Design a protein around this ligand. Sequence first.
Ligand SMILES: CCCCCCCCCCCCCCCCCC(=O)OC[C@H](COP(=O)([O-])OCC[N+](C)(C)C)OC(=O)CCCCCCCCCCCCCCCCC
Ligand SMILES: CCCCCCCCCCCCCCCCCC(=O)OC[C@H](COP(=O)([O-])OCC[N+](C)(C)C)OC(=O)CCCCCCCCCCCCCCCCC
Ligand SMILES: *C(=O)CCCCCCCCCCCCC
Lengths: 111, 122, 177, 171, 65, 62, 155, 165, 50, 459, 87, 70, 79
Amino acid sequence: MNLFSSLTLVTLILLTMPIAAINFNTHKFTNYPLYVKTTISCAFITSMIPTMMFIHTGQEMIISNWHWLTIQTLKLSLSFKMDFFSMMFVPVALFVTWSIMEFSMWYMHSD
Amino acid sequence: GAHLARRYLGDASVEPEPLRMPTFPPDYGFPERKEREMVATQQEMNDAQLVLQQRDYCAHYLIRFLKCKRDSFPNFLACKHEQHDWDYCEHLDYVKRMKEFERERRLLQRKKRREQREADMA
Amino acid sequence: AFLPSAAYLTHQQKVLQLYKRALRHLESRCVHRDKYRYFACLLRARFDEHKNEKDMVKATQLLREAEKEFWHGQHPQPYIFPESPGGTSYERYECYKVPEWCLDDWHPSEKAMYPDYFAKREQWKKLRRESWEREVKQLQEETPVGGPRTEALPPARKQGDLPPLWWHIVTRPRERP
Amino acid sequence: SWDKDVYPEPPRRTPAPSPQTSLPNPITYLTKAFDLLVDRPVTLVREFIERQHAKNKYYYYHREFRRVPDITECHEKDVLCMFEAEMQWKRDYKVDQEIVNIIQERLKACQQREGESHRQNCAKELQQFTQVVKAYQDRYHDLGAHYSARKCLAKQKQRMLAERKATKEAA
Amino acid sequence: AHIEPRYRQFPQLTRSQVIQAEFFSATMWFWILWRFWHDSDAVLGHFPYPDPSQWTDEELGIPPD
Amino acid sequence: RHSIFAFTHVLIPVWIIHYYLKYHVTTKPYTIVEKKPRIFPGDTILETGEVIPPMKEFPDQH
Amino acid sequence: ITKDMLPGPYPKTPEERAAAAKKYNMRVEDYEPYPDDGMGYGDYPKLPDRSQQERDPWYDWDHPDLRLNWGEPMHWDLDMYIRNRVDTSPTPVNWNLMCKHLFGFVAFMLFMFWVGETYPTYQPVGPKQYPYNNLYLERGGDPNKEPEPVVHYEI
Amino acid sequence: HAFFKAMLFMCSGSIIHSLNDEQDIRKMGGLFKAMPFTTTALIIGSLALTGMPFLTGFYSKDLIIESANTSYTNAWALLMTLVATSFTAIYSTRIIFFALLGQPRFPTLININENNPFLINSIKRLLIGSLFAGFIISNNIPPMTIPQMTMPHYLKMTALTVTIL
Amino acid sequence: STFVAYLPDYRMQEWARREAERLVKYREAHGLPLMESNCFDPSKIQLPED
Amino acid sequence: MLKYIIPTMMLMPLTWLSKNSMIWINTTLHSLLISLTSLLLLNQFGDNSLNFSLTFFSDSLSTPLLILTMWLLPLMLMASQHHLSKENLARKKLFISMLILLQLFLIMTFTATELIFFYIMFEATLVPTLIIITRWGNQTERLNAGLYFLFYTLAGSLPLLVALIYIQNTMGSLNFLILQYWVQPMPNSWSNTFMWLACMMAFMVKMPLYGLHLWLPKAHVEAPIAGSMVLAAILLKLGGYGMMRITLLLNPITDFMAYPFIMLSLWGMIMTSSICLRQTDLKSLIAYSSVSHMALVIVAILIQTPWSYMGATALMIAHGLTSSMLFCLANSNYERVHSRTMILARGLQTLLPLMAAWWLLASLTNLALPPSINLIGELFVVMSTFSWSNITIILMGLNMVITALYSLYMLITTQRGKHTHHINNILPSFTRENALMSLHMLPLLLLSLNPKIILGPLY
Amino acid sequence: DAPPLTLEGIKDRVLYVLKLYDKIDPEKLSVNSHFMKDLGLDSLDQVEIIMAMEDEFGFEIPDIDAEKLMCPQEIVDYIADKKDVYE
Amino acid sequence: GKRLFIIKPSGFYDKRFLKLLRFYILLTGIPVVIGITLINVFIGEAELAEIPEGYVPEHWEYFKHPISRW
Amino acid sequence: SKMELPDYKQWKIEGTPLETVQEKLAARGLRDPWGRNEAWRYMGGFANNVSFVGALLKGFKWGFAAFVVAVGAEYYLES
Ligand SMILES: CCCCCCCCCCCCCCCCCC(=O)OC[C@H](COP(=O)([O-])OCC[N+](C)(C)C)OC(=O)CCCCCCCCCCCCCCCCC
Ligand SMILES: CCCCCCCCCCCCCCCCCC(=O)OC[C@H](COP(=O)([O-])OCC[N+](C)(C)C)OC(=O)CCCCCCCCCCCCCCCCC
Ligand SMILES: *C(=O)CCCCCCCCCCCCC
């Protein structure tokens, strides 16, 4: 239980971190596209682990971590759903994005 | 596929419809018919979290296959024999459904023949 | 009838432009080179058959019927060159064509990173500002009464002076900045 | 920690791992790596933080509201009692809203926990949700954006008048 | 170092990319042939299909009169 | 410095959010709700040691 | 700028028409203002009403993005006929034939969809049989009410 | 579809970049031997799109059309799905014929090159995906619905026959 | 933003939860219904005759 | 509320006894300190409003407007110190005193527990605004803009006062705390019909309402930047606050009475969005967008549901911030190119990258990209108006498309495409302008984290 | 990608394309040879030459500039001005 | 290798503004987060307890965090 | 920087379909002066391109050999 949610939220945090890295630059970034590509590959592995966890056991999770806004009867909270669809879609999309960014590092070199 | 041509381009009073079956009683023409037997218990089917469409008349093969798939990680191709058993059972169920369709069609044809004979004698 | 130097299109230019457009659309119609070459020779025969036609109104009617023939059988999606208007790569690099006068707004700290280039830029600006009055006096003494008739600009007819209005055409950004 | 009674949870039954093949699953190895590299330093840091907490312990209390007379024993246009009745009604309104939120949380937790057999195993939570939603709708709905205790009292009076008319016409 | 461009002749090829392309095509064809040899049922058919008109009358409970 | 990316980008966020989930998310009720593990006949419950009995003998067809 | 260069009322006398044509920098014969029906146009000219895509793209325009010159009179609907917006380029196929073909295509396939919905296709099987009174308890039924007994027989 | 379509666009982008930013198929050809890796990957992707058995596209599209055949569905929608399958095969081999086979049609200055490591590695990874990922996923996922396996012979071979035609 | 983030229990939005956490634990323990259909007690309200 | 009025009044001895060129620094510093101290008004309770004395009280509705006003004053002083650099020192001090007086009247308007005092300050906000528009504008038409702005508002507000005085002769008091307990139902009659009209038409005029909005495109595009900010972000919310205070006394006659105004606003949002699709002026485009958003707020207030009220106040705050940012963007472009034509200066992304980023961000917050508070308010109003009727969503949904059809358009014509060739006075972005846009946007982006402070007095 | 073009390369390419034309014998033409008088060509042949250079260099020459190009040096200068060579 | 000059607008002023913005944010961001962490680690949070008899809490004693109580 | 060009005299239309075009035009009566310019596409390394069925069967020989080898290997290990 303490591994599924931790690995998926650290996938999300790891993917959102280079945006904070590029938003706090002073010099010129040395191989920023390589940095983003390496980040996405690491996030793909980190997402692939709960995929085989779900393949073995069949664990589904709901992570309602941040309570955002209680409006009378309705409650809006930061809730993440880990089920068959998310676990079989996230590594596929991350693998495709990894290949796409390597190809774009080749193709968009002169821009 | 010929039954669509027999029902649409032919006569619909003989071909059975898939929306409502059966119309003939199950005890008509069948001397002491026997009912199908359930092997999987309702509680066993309940705590295995089977899908409601997956809870057919031989879901025990599905339960055994799911247990083998769960207990043979990470060898995902280890025990396809249980999958073959489940496929054979659902094929037998489909064969039974085809037999029921043919029985209904033949009984409807017999009823049409009976009323045609009544028209002939009168 | 929209030209930069002339006021109208003559008959010869109309025939040449029709021939060029017809050959381009024929090249678009048949993909392979040998078939295009065969049908281009056929079209060249069709155009060469009526070359020596001294009747002017017959040439006009031949032009009209040839234009109707071309409009009847042109490709729905003709081949367009990538840098031609309507192409895939048309005006793509206009987001990188920064004008030169932005270099006048650069900070002196970043102006010291390229000393010799900015020295040459200062020399260019001095040349332009010393030739501007001479070229505007050349323009004002050559334009006839009632303004210019065409948009053609006169060249530099003297020694040492530059052609008038030369700055924004010489110092245009490159096609690949 | 929380309260196990107001937030119930059925007893957990995890089946024992009984592997068939000889291939080692990577999940056990990664669980060991997570327990060694990650769980122990976090536990040590939290234990140090709790040890620092134990030196200085101070308490915060839950505010207790005594009962004041409600709007049914307030004279007409006497502000000094309808004021207190109005604020008590507002506090009860917020408490009722959070009660319905708790029941909604119970229903969603049951639906997600019971899996594909959620239609049969969570009938009690659905019936409690239906009852509390019916009570909330009969008590607070259609009051308007300018709701007050007097509007709720008028709605209740209309409801009992209609109920009396209906039970008179059936007898 | 790099590949020098050529004018209206055949381009210069690298041995490595030719080897990789042949290897991947061979791997694709080997995978297809191996899966057709082993599985062989997802294409032609998993189970036989009986004839509905071939079923006998007494097993269908048809009353003869 | 060969494992800077494996440390400052994975291990430190894993520590931070594992602390956050263990001592601030699971403290509140009904935040992390999990689907119950699948129970099959012939298994054994780890919590109290009860054994689920196996199914009825199969009417074999092949 | 000055007062007698801004637009004004609708010209009536030929001298006013010539003055307005000189103000708008074109010929008197090509100066056709909007008709004075009281819609508020005034003396603004009625340009030939075509998009900027029909202009010559190879000409040295003063504004090559919009294909417009300097000092030339703008259209009343120039914000509608820019290259980011509605185009009036000559199509290879006539407008009426295109509209009739598209409408016939859509209507024919909608009609055939309705016809196929009237006569669906299927496979010669009976209804699927589920145990335990068609799973009465598993469909969310109440356990107190005993369901009507549905029995499926072997075939 | 995400797998093989992403890799097909990657191959098309490599071909476009190798022909000086030209996106027209009428000025292509002769690239069967000029770019062998792009040729191989494009052929594999088109085969997987058309429904080559035991590739990625077989394990989803064939089951989809088998479930759509033997079901209580609209007849017209099924017929148009079959026609659309045939048309997918048609335009796939049209791309193969025009873009890759025949005789060259590009301008004379040839600067064809694809030997950068980034393009080769990305196409290689997506090629391995488009070869094995459908099989791996279809054998790893748990069942959720009963698959249809008892169908007559003419309905089982319908997708392959339509693709071949 | 630090002052806004650490506001002391804005509009008692937390408190109304916690009191509710008590109140349900009352009425679930003694078999009472969770919420009555009448906001006020029916015994202390007079209706006009009809 | 005496702890906020006194420093605001003391700002005038600060700006009149300052040095020759230290007026802007001192006024900005002390107004920012007042804005910092303004956060003490967040002492709100779930049942009780914050009552200070017999004259001033602050609910959870007036508090965000007060904080927005006292935050807007330093931004206003920062915005209006570039086109007044050539001004006389006495005229500069007069302008700063006008802004201070207007802010004082604004923060005394929202806290008034008496409707007569609220009305008096609500009309007292007219004089400094009219003086600023008619004196420190740029065009000729400002003089005409000084009339349509004035004689509209009074024409709505002079009957309303009479109605308010009638309440003083009927209920015995006009205190809002008393009237919450002494309110009476309003029977259906012609007298109550015209009293509803008298009590509402002032707030329909000052919001504005479609049909009565004719003063807003005129008083937005001739006014200076500070006037545009004060009309867009604060002065259009006086009508909403007055509606929310006065709807309590006008029940239950509002159920069948609100129909024509609801239809007028529901068609006026489409009409003003379509007008925005064809406007040749940036300032007029922002003005008509303001008209559309305030028509949405009018619908939300008139249907009077809790979700509608929440969406109304969230939309008010979000629209105020977004319209202020858009007007400052338009002012910077006008100061750089010396014209108001949209089509004149194109392709500014190749010259100002950071201003292009600010333009993109402001256009993003204009079309209510989630999870900004613009989307929160507009979404909640949509939910409430779907509860009201099931067809109105169509009249919402189409409007959404047209919003995304002009805001991005307002981006593209100003940012993308080939740059114009004959404009070569495009200076780089100043630090003051970038500071202004960051101070406009960062509170708006931060409020998405904690929106519960701008969700009205019934959260 | 996109190797640079020099004046020598452009002149060599235009002479190659003109040399591969059957109407122009290779032993008489020069770089400053006019099409109409020095080589005795036709207007249709001039259009064919222009579109041959268009297909050779991969970019389109407008008609208003194509009608004034009648000598290989003019074509070299026009392509040099368009492609911004010799930087 | 024949390097050509790339003409671009002056990005010095935007970079200066961004650097000043980052500095003036962090200048009080770092001490605030340091003090918040030091308060949360050492002072810590409160505990929920029942009100003893004969004693009434202060109006600031109903809140958990030390910053909220202050 | 310096790109040398091949000889112009080798570009003859022999062995290409441009002679088929030339025969068709000569039977009709005209000339094709642009055959030598397009002769480069049909000669050299770009001549004799593969067919579509030969394009689909790329690498089939090595794949068939590997399939036979693997089948024989699994037949040896199954015994
Ligand atoms: C890289 C450096 C990282 C930091 C290093 C130093 C810190 C190390 C880790 C320790 C952190 C501190 C302890 C744990 C956290 C605090 C626990 C806690 O109670 O926190 C209070 C709360 C938890 O919620 P809560 O339930 O306590 O608060 C509810 C409050 N009321 C009742 C008023 C509503 O906040 C957090 O924990 C912060 C969550 C941050 C993640 C989410 C960010 C969202 C940003 C976008 C906003 C818009 C979203 C829109 C969509 C919303 C959903 C639909
Ligand atoms: C109000 C009307 C006037 C409007 C104008 C006002 C002008 C003056 C402005 C004054 C200052 C600002 C005041 C409002 C402050 C609002 C913020 C605030 O304090 O919120 C409280 C909330 C409080 O959270 P909470 O309520 O859940 O926590 C419970 C309360 N405490 C904190 C006491 C335990 O703060 C947060 O949520 C902060 C969470 C941690 C910081 C953010 C972490 C995530 C950041 C993003 C990560 C990456 C995401 C993906 C990015 C991808 C790329 C884009
Ligand atoms: C029996 O004939 C009915 C079969 C199902 C309905 C018709 C399906 C038609 C498409 C599949 C077969 C295509 C054969 C080329």
